[PDB]
């Protein structure tokens, strides 16, 4: 049912649909090493992707409803030169008629132009002053639907944000070729990332778009804060979703020392451009593969690994005493050889029992395969210590709201631009 | 109070670059300064006001200030580590790419 | 003729030994021992004074290089002259008379040196004090030896070397207790100033006058009277010795049984007397190099020179290398500031151990700042203003000054190395020396402490030697202690920190003292009473000359390598031990 | 016996000799306000003085001996640009033949050139590294004599400096016009002052030269350090000639306070250029007219004046208590209404009884016209206080060498360039 589906292949980009759209790329188009299927577009002229469809699938009707889906990653806007700088990322307008998606400061805009110059705009606005954002430098699943009789709707991660009637619009023409390029950007260091572009010749409903989001979310693969693939042997800062104003810290080395949530986080500010919180605070949590037989560095679901903690640029190991008081027992970082038989195995969990994707969680287990439980935090004498217990699993069995069993991995990224 | 204002010193057009500092200042106004890649570690500022100044790639650490303000000041790529320079001490100022880390505890107002 | 003289000398020596055995050991010997110990403590004190007062005397007297070294080395030249002079004179004028004269010269010139303000005058006064004190050890030993019987001579003589270390600890203690009080600025005359080191000099001169006061109450050596044909008073001195000993014992009723003593038969005016004195003094000196004593004298020369060279070289080497290690550690901790622009800023600050390279200062004013070991290099000062600036070890190398003013500063022209001044003014310059002088604070204290340790290191070995001097023998103890001294010299490689060198200095000082005691005893017993003091004084002058040579050589080698000092010291000590092993044995004999 | 004598007149320069040489003066040639007879020449092209003689007095012989004389004042040389920059100040050559006066760094040069281009040079060299100089920025009486048979000699202030034989020189031609301008100086801020230029058709001996020096010295007028006229109501720093390394200072105000000689003076240094001593150190002496009926400000010989003393920018008065112990009694500066009947009248002396010119001196006298004596300095317990005693007068009567009764008046000058 898809007309265009740009999917990576052996050092090229092909179309999954049975239409054979011509695809040509520039010499300055970059690709991620681990996740090649995502494409980086930089502010230049040669950084261009042209895709030519067939004349039998060119949008030239008036009652024809259509939709499309993609994943987009927009870095943070750093200076005032990005204000009021509406620039186009994807253009399908010829002779002043077509559909076009474009980006402004904290804005993603879908524009429809008919043969009668009429403009209809659907706008998704995300703030840049928030402490922790779900959109700034993070992958966003953006789709639009366009029903020529009722409305045009924007979906971000499968949820309604905005809708605008398009009944007044007449006949809308479309270009034979589709453009992937930053057009009209005055910022010379501005780039975006895009992947999984799909086009459909009808208005999609909530159920189909949610199914698409789940299918392309790669629920069986771990994800970090930015939405990329989780990897071994890479330092990650820690974030607790239910306590996002504190970071993991250590006090003493060994069992006698405890890892706790220290606060508050700092801020990064540029005087009416952004007032975000610092994500590069705390101690780094490296992941070391233990029993995963996969050759690649990507971390998958149900993997059994070990966790190292970087303290004064020295790698220690996660461990806890299995036999002590209570189930809410204290975790610690100790020297790598001196663990002995202390519990170190952690199972990575991304998707639940029913298969619904959720944020990454770590399950501490012993050598005997007995579940210590999900790693969380609990308050001892006003101090939030890292505790692994089966209480979170008890709430999961009871379908209750767990408190403290979700984590986010923040690696250093160039789209955030915070000094370390 | 009025006598205190009378004894206030004024320092115009002051350039400092690539210098490390600890000092205690009291009852001064520094106007039109220009500081580049300076490290300000452990300084006490009482009734000291910086006006029309420019700090670029500077570094503040362990800064404590009472009745200190940065009015008409511009900060570029500067880092405030372990300081109590809260947001009410920057009056009509412009911070660019500036980071506040490990802020000291204090009341929201003066 | 020679046979008759030898027989007469042998008979005199045997009868003198019999008389001494009859008199016995007792209170008189210990009283004379304490008096001569005061005399030797004066010598022990004299060798530390200039070394302790140099850090203050350089600032108080504007001392440059080649003036600190000569001031440090002048005491040994003084003793080299004085030992020979008084040793030659004592065999013709008496032991006690020449001891009194030499100690009086030492006291007078040491008193004068404490109030002298110049450098040449201070050099002269200290050289004359060294001349006065040079004749202490030869006369003291050759004078105490003539009151001891052959039964216990090595131990009773070796107990006399305790006072040298006692004087060392006294000097160290008073240096600790006087010098650090830099505040004392007693003013007697506007153009002159008296600091604490002059008080230290006076207090160090005190033991010499104490020694003179003690010596005024003792009788002359009877042997000197007997050799010079003077009979009656030698008999009275022996009678006094016997009477004192027996009264102390508890039997004040027996009578001196000696009635007649064998005596050596004797066979413009001021100029004649001086010419005659030079005559038979030269005669005694040459007869020391006679057919009967020519091998022994050469062995003495070799042993004395080698041990003096090694000991004094290492003794002056250890503190120098401690200072070098401290200096290298100081230079390790130096801060460097490359590139620095400061404009329109007023300043007061204190800077220590810093290097500011390539700065640019325009229209700054530097009011009231202190600079310790601060170097400004490749800097540019334009329309600057300096005021109330004090600087120790501060230099302006490759700097450029334009339209700058130096008001009330001590920035003298030697602090501007390869610098360029343009339209610059110096006004109200502070008073100061034309060159650089270093100030020492708590660093002096450790110095004194180190010195104390060295003297304490001497304490054990002395006792051991003093307990075994007669039991094992002179030659064996001399060679044995020289061997451990050479081994300690070889072990110098295993030390590169201050604590390690303190330990090494203590070990070497504790090891060589037995060798020195044995050498003193052997020198005493190897000569007859008519050239004992002459030979001992000549050998002590040789020791002082070797001390000068070793001090210069070993101070020239500090901070270069640690193989030249080890090689030199070990070679010299091995040569000395080899030459000492081929000497005659004098453990049991009559003093002759 | 004089051929040319450039003297000042009513707003022009004329010739005292009976030859009427034409004079042309540029538009940038200046004059001193008080001593207009001294002419300032700067380093420009319009600052020129032309003197055209008659054809009957132009030097064109070979046996003819001749002399020249003038007063010259050369400021300090401040930087290395002035080094090796021999520049002509007085030019009388034509077709590479004639006599020329020039100046180099610390050098005054007289050059003779014949028709065969043979060059003879006589040089007076003064050092710029001296603490106090008699030549730097001070008026110098230069005389040059040229006898064609034996030698050519230079005289600085009436004393011989150098003599170079000129017997080898042939016929010397001279220009009809004589130059006065700085020719060939690379320094744009370099000027000279010149006065009383005279030319003679014969070689002058020592007697005539000393007579000329004494006549042109104006021995009846007091001169300051730079050689100019001494004026009332002008602040002067004070220098003792016998003790030139100490400056006049005061300690307390009033009779209980004494004026003394504090030292040493500082230095003014430009590396490898000058290492002079500071002249602007101490307390300024202002002179006020009391009985002088002259309308002009110029201080003359035998004038009876008062001496204010500037301490902390406040003017006190010279006075001493006539009745006290000894003859050498201490002088002091006191409040101007406090003086009462203290000895404050002073008589300014320049020339001695015979009329021989000597340095400035001050004779303190009482209201009864009794000579307290010449103001000097004497040491009491290593402090050199100013004492007014008749001992100096006794030595003058005995023709003995007085010690410390001669002073020098140093005002601020632009040719010295020392910062105050
Ligand atoms: C503000 O910073 C961003 C990010 O740069 C980082 O953060 C800075 C505070 C400083 O620590 C930098 O060293 C960091 O790399 C800047 O945007 C980037 O600037 C670099 C230039 O160093 C350039 O190479 C990148 O391409 C830029 N990236 C983007 C997305 O623009 C930004 O320029 C800074 N703003 C100002 C006004 O300086
Ligand atoms: C060195 O100084 C002289 C004299 O100037 C005075 O002294 C200086 C130290 C400074 O304090 C100045 O402000 C003083 O006025 C300079 O020569 C004069 O320079 C001024 C310019 O300021 C100029 O107007 C005069 O004509 C100059 N006079 C002469 C006789 O040339 C000199 O330029 C200074 N040297 C350098 C390298 O700057
Ligand atoms: C100056 O600041 C440093 C760093 O905070 C501190 O170690 C030092 O003690 C301070 N100096 C003074 C005099 O307080
Ligand atoms: C200070 O403020 C004024 C206006 O209030 C502005 O023109 C000026 O640029 C400011 N100073 C600086 C250094 O920007
Ligand atoms: C700094 O210097 C000024 C002027 O010399 C002086 O008054 C002040 O006491 C100094 N401050 C310190 C701390 O030494
Ligand atoms: C330092 O000296 C070198 C030569 O010794 C010179 O080339 C350099 O210019 C000097 N530094 C400066 C800042 O001029
Ligand atoms: C009085 C002892 C003296 C000696 N003649 O042996 N000593 C011992 C060490 C150095 C020295 O001169």
Q: How far apart are CA C232 and CA D147, in angstroms?
A: 101
**How long, in residues, is chain D?**
420
DSSP 8-state secondary structure symbol assigned to residue D297: S
Nearest to C479 by CA among C568, C405, C574, C546: C574
Q: Is C320 in the pocket of ligand 6 (CB under 6 A)?
A: no
Give yes or no for residue B52 CB within 6 A of ligand 4.
yes
Q: How far is the CA of C364 from the centre of ligand 4 (A)?
A: 25
* Both structure tokens of B3: 């006598």
Separation between Cα atoms, residue B67 and residue B109, nearest integer Å: 11
Write out chain B residues lying below 8 Å of C338, CB-based. 18
Residue B18's CATH number: 2.160.20.80
- Tell the residue nearest (CA) to atom 3 of ligand 5: C368
- Which neighbouring-strand residues pair with C375? C355, C395
Question: C68 and C199: one domain?
Answer: yes
Closest CA to D44 of D185, D179, D197: D185
3-state secondary structure of D326: coil
What CATH number is associated with residue D171? Answer: 2.60.120.200
Structural domain contains residue C414: yes
Q: Do B99 and A271 touch (CB under 8 A)?
A: no
3-class secondary structure per residue, C203-258: HHHHHHHHHHHHHCCCCCCHHHHHHCCCCHHHHHHHHHHHHHHHHHHCCCCCCCCC
B12: closest CA of chain C, how far (Å): 8
Q: What 3-state class would DSSP assign to D56?
A: coil
How far is D415 from A67, CA to CA, in rounded Å?
90
Nearest bound ligand to the CA of residue C510? 7
Picking from B96, B99, B103, the nearest residue to A271 by CB comes out as: B96
Q: Which residues of chain D have a CB within 8 Å of the CB of C191?
A: 382
Tell me if D271 and C420 make a contact (CB, 8 A cut-off).
Answer: yes
Which among C191, C421, C428 is the nearest to D271, CB-wise? C421
Among A264, A271, A419, the residue with its CB nearest the CB of B99 is A419
Domain boundary among C193, C224, C255: C224
Same domain, D173 and D305: no
Determine the Cα–Cα distance for residues C72 and C233; give it in Å rounded to an integer.
44
Query: Do A38 and A150 belong together in one domain?
Result: yes
**Ligand 2 atom showing the smallest separation from residue D415 Cα:** 30
Subunit partners of chain C (3 or more CB pairs within 8 A): B, D
Residue A95, judged by CB atoms within 10 A of its CB (0-12, 13-18, 19+), counts as exposed
Listed in order, strand segments (DSSP E) in C15-167 are none
Question: Could you identify the atom of ligand 5 that is nearest to the CA of residue C350?
Answer: 14
User: Are the Cβ atoms of C343 and B18 closer than 8 angstroms?
Assistant: no
| Residues sharing a CB contact under 8 Å with residue D104, sequence separation 6 or more, in sequence order | D84, D85, D86, D87
Same domain, A250 and A144: no
Are D266 and C426 a contacting pair at CB < 8 A? yes
Domain annotation covers residue B69: yes
Q: A309: closest CA among A300, A301, A318? A: A318
Going by CA atoms, what residue is nearest to atom 7 of ligand 7? C516
Cross-strand bridge partners of residue A167? none
Number of domains in chain B: 1
Closest Cβ–Cβ partner in D78, D266, D417 for C427: D266
Residue D324 Cα to chain centre, angstroms: 39
Closest CA of chain B from C343, distance in Å: 5
Nearest CA in chain B to C347: B23
Q: What angle do CA C191, C192, C196 make, to 5 degrees?
A: 155
Proximal ligand: closest to the CA of B34: 4
Helix (H, G, I), strand (E, B) or coil at C287: helix
Please identify, by atom number, the ligand 7 atom nearest to the C-alpha of residue C43: 1
Resolution at which this structure was determined, Å: 2.9
Q: Which of D94, D107, D237 is nearest to D172 (CA)?
A: D94
How was this model experimentally determined? cryo-EM
Residues D278 and D165 reside in one and the same domain: no
Give the E-state strand segments of chain B in sequence order. 9-12, 15-17, 20-21, 24-31, 34-36, 39-41, 44-51, 54-56, 59-61, 64-66, 69-71, 74-76, 79-81, 90-91, 94-96, 98-101
The total number of structural domains in chain D stands at 2
Residues on chain D touching C428 (C-beta within 8 angstroms): 266
Same domain, C219 and C339: no
A125 and A249 inside one domain: no
Which of D9, D2, D6 lies closest to D179, judged by CA?
D6
In a domain, residue B107? The reply is no
Domain that holds residue C37: 23-224
Chain B: closest CA distance from residue C328 (Å): 26
B/C interface, count of CB pairs below 8 Å: 30
Instruction: Give ∠ CA C176-C177-C182 in degrees, rounded to 5.
Output: 90
CATH number at residue D320: 2.80.10.50
Boundary residue ending a domain (C224, C253, C278): C224
In a domain, B62, yes or no: yes
List of residues 6+ apart from C523 with CB closer than 8 A? C141, C300, C304, C535, C536, C539
Which of B11, B13, B17 to probe the C interface (max C CBs under 10 A)? B17
Ligand 7 atom, smallest distance to C311 CA = 10
CATH code, domain with C28: 1.20.1250.20
Location of structure tokens 């290099």:
C377
Strand C385-387 versus strand C400-402 pairing type = unpaired
| C327 in reach of chain B (CB within 8 A) | no
- Distance of alpha carbon A76 from alpha carbon A278, whole angstroms: 13
Identify the residue whose C-alpha is closest to ligand 5 atom 1: C348
Last residue of a domain, which of C374, C403, C427?
Answer: C427
CA of A284 to the centre of ligand 1 (A): 23
Return the ∠ at Cα D327 (arms to D326 and D329), rounded to 5°.
85
- Give the CA distances from residue A367 to residues A255, A334, A371, A405, D264, in Å, rounded to whole numbers and listed in that order: 19, 18, 10, 21, 90
Work out how many CB contacts closer than 8 A connect C with D: 35
Written as one string, the DSSP assignment of D98-144 is EEEEEEETTEEEEEEE-TT--EEEEEEE--SSSSS-SSTTS-EEEEE
CA B22 to ligand 3 centroid distance, Å: 6
What is the residue range of D381's domain? 237-410
- Same domain assignment for residues A29 and A160: yes
**CA dihedral sign, ordered C227, C228, C230, C234:** negative
Among A79, A266, A419, select the one facing B102 at the smallest CB separation: A266
Task: Report the DSSP pairing between strands D98-104 and D87-93.
Answer: antiparallel
User: What SS3 class is residue D181?
Assistant: coil
Cβ–Cβ under 8 Å, residues A118 and A96: no
Token pair belonging to A34: 């681990």
Whole-angstrom Cα distance, residue A239 to residue A6?
34
Q: Counting beta carbons within 10 angstroms of the beta carbon of residue D334, is it exposed (0 to 12), middle (13 to 18) or buried (19 or more)?
A: buried
A225 within a domain of the structure (yes/no): no
Q: What's phi and psi for A86, nearest 5 deg?
A: -55, 115
Q: Residue A187 CA: which ligand 1 atom is closest?
A: 31
Phi, psi angles (nearest 5°) of residue D123: -125, 130
Ligand closest to A80 (CA) is 1
Structure tokens at A261: 């949530």
DSSP strand pairing (B24-31 vs B9-12): parallel
- Tell me the chain A residues in contact with residue B100 when contact means C-beta distances shorter than 8 Å: 266-269
Chain C residues near any Cβ of chain D (below 8 Å) = 190-191, 403, 405, 419-429
Q: Does one domain contain both D245 and D163?
A: no
Between CA D347 and CA D304 the distance in angstroms is: 4
Residue B53 lies in a domain: yes
Same domain, D197 and D244: no
- Residues from chain B that touch A414, judged by Cβ atoms under 8 A, are none
Residues C38 and C159 in one domain: yes
Regarding the beta carbon of B22 and ligand 1, being less than 6 Å apart is answered no
């Amino acid at each position: 049912t898809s007309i265009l589906s740009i999917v990576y292949k052996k050092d090229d980009l092909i179309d999954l649909s049975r239409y054979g759209a011509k695809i040509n790329i520039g010499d300055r188009v970059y690709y991620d090493s681990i996740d090649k299927n995502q494409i980086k577009l930089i502010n230049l002229e040669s950084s261009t992707i042209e895709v030519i469809l067939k004349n039998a699938i060119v949008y030239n009707s008036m009652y024809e409803n259509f939709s499309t889906s993609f994943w987009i990653k927009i870095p943070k806007y750093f200076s005032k030169i990005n204000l009021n700088n509406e620039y186009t990322i994807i253009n399908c307008i010829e002779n002043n008629s077509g559909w076009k998606v474009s980006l402004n400061y904290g804005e993603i805009i879908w524009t429809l132009q008919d043969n009668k110059q009429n403009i209809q705009r659907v706008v998704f606005k995300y703030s840049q002053m928030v402490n922790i954002s779900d959109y700034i430098n993070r992958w966003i699943f953006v789709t639009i639907t366009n029903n020529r009789l009722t409305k045009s709707k924007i979906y971000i991660n499968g949820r309604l944000i905005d809708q605008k009637p398009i009944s007044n619009l007449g006949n809308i023409h479309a270009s034979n070729k589709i453009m992937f390029k930053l057009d009209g950007c005055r910022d010379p260091r501005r780039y975006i990332m895009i992947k999984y572009f799909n086009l459909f010749d009808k208005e999609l409903n909530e159920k189909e778009i949610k199914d698409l989001y789940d299918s392309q979310s790669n629920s069986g693969i771990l994800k970090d804060f930015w939405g990329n693939y989780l990897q071994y042997d890479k330092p990650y800062y820690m974030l607790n979703l239910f306590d996002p104003n504190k970071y993991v810290d250590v006090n003493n080395i060994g069992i006698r020392g405890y890892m706790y949530l220290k606060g508050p986080r700092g801020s990064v500010v540029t005087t009416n451009i952004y007032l975000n919180s610092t994500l590069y605070e705390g101690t780094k949590f490296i992941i070391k593969k233990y029993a995963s037989g996969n050759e690649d560095n990507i971390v998958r679901n149900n993997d059994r690994v070990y966790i190292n903690v970087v303290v004064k640029n020295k790698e220690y190991r996660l461990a806890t005493n299995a036999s002590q008081a209570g189930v809410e027992k204290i975790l610690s970082a100790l020297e790598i050889p001196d663990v002995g038989n202390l519990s170190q195995v952690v199972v990575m969990k991304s998707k639940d029992d029913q298969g619904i994707r959720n944020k990454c969680k770590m399950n501490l287990q012993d050598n005997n395969g007995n579940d210590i439980g999900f790693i969380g935090f609990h308050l001892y004498d006003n101090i939030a210590k890292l505790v692994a217990s089966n209480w979170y699993n008890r709430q999961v069995g009871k379908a209750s709201r767990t408190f403290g069993c979700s984590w986010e991995f923040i690696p250093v990224d160039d789209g955030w631009g915070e000094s370390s | 109070a009025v006598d205190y204002a009378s004894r206030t010193k004024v320092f115009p057009g002051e350039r400092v670059e690539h210098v490390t500092f600890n000092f205690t200042l009291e009852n001064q106004i520094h106007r039109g300064g220009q500081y580049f890649n300076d490290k300000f570690i452990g300084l006490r500022l009482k009734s000291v006001s910086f006006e029309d100044s420019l700090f670029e790639e500077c570094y503040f650490e362990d800064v404590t200030s009472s009745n200190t303000f940065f009015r008409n000041c511009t900060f570029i790529n500067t880092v405030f580590y372990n300081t109590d320079l809260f947001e009410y001490k920057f009056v009509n100022s412009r911070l660019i790419n500036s980071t506040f880390l490990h802020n000291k505890e204090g009341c929201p107002l003066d």
